[PDB]
Amino acid sequence: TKDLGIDLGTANTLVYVKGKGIVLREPSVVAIQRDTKQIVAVGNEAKNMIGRTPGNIVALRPMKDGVIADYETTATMMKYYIRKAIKTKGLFAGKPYVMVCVPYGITAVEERAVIDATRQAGARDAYTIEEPFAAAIGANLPVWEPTGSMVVDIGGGTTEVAVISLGGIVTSQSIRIAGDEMDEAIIQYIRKSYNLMIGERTAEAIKMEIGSAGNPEGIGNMEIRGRDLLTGLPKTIEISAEEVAEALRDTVYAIVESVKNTLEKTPPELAADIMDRGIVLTGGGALLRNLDKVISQETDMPVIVAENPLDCVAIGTGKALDHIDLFK
Ligand SMILES: Nc1ncnc2c1ncn2[C@@H]1O[C@H](COP(=O)(O)OP(=O)(O)OP(=O)(O)O)[C@@H](O)[C@H]1O
């Protein structure tokens, strides 16, 4: 019987097996029959279904923009990801134990729902770890010592800020402001400034290539193709990093404010530890050009992007399987 940690992200799902490490990296996507709502495929299998299936099948991210997925969706996705990860040719394989990463502050009712869905999906039993703690373990922070640590996980739908000390979360804030809203800010900006409509792929490409959080000087320029909203015809334009930084500015400073505010609620001595140690960013949204510089300047604090920021949460969920009792 294997032991799994699962990060069912708003954009990316990762499964970690004790002993092996991360074995699965697939988008958090479902293929749904538009009229019956039936989920017909998950993950990569959902991707393999679209364009190849007669019915009105649609690929959707159930947690886009940090929306909480309902019970049935959660249990259907979990069942796919659990089955795919423990796929070994053999016998005498018991139902796995599963650590599920969850948001900070989940109500006891919601937590029971996650556990129930995860057992329903095939787990012998399921446990939870709060995401900022998973993230801090995966970023090699000293979560068990008395010193203050700070982590900021920016994903697709959610940013989570947490000061950690002595094996617990001391102060924490979660906002639905992250990679999806950054993409939407770019789409809206081009829509108002150029009466042009671009899709999510293009907004993502724009954000990765010339997106930036602070001074955009020297980042350059991009040619992008979209649809003219007056004529309906494809149309190509030129956008500057200055424009993109301007489009992102309010999203960035919502994130910066969450960091500042959390620090301002934290016990002063844990803050001074953080000032010495530094803030660690995790999640794919931490890769936004110069976000680490901006947060450092607005807090007068060191800021480091953790190595492999897209895996920290999943690694931390995996290492929690070494001391399961501490999460029961
Ligand atoms: N180079 C980059 N610059 C900016 N954003 C990036 C970059 N690479 C990836 N991202 C963003 O990171 C996000 C995905 O990160 P991640 O997988 O950590 O999110 P998530 O699935 O919501 O995670 P979780 O729910 O576990 O916190 C996407 O919004 C993506 O656009």
Residue numbers in the entry: 6 to 333
Question: Which sentences did the original study use to describe this structure?
Answer:
The electron density map clearly revealed the presence of three phosphates, demonstrating that the ATP had not been hydrolyzed into ADP. This is probably due to the absence of a Mg2+ ion in the catalytic site. No residual electron density peak could be interpreted as a Mg2+ ion with appropriate coordination. As a consequence, the binding mode of the nucleotide is distinct from other MreB structures, with the γ-phosphate located in the Mg2+ binding site. The structure of the ATP-bound form of MreBGs is highly similar to the apo form, with a rmsd of 1.41 Å over 313 aligned Cα atoms. However, ATP binding induced a small closure of the nucleotide-binding pocket, and loop β6-α2, which was disordered in the apo structure, is fully visible in the electron density map. The hydrophobic loop α2-β7 and the N-terminus also display an alternative conformation. Despite multiple co-crystallization trials, in the ATP-bound state the crystal packing only revealed monomers and never straight protofilaments as in the apo structure. Comparison of the crystal structures of apo and ATP-bound MreBGs shows that only minor conformational changes occur upon nucleotide-binding, in agreement with what was observed when comparing crystal structures of MreBCc and MreB5Sc in different nucleotide-bound states.
